[PDB]
Design goal:
This is part of a larger assembly, with two copies of chain A (54 residues). With 54 residues, chain A is mainly beta. The first copy, chain A, has no helices and two strands. The first copy, chain A, has a two-stranded antiparallel sheet with strand order 1-2. Chains A, B: It is found in: Virion.
């Protein structure tokens, strides 16, 4: 492999420079389901949680 | 792999150009380890070899 920085210039070449590297990956996502309700129907004013702040 | 000129230009691409390469490596080092013999103790004046020059 070869590694590049954001300019597209090469910055390491694992084969020509006698280096090894490890690659990791993971796929996820999340959602909250704050459905319409008889208590507080105006959705902008509901949340299923609260916080303590200073 | 890819092979680079030291300026950062790609010279060869092994996969795209249907080429194979072989890499040889070796790791080594050496030391003279001259001993304190009973004669000529002054280390700066002592060496276990001599040369002919012109």
């Amino acid at each position: 492999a070869v590694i590049q920085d954001n300019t597209g210039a090469i910055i390491y070449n694992l084969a020509q420079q006698d280096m090894t590297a490890l690659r990791l990956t993971f796929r996820v996502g999340w959602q909250v389901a704050n459905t319409l309700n008889n208590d507080q129907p105006t959705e902008a004013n509901r949340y299923p949680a609260a916080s303590l702040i200073f």
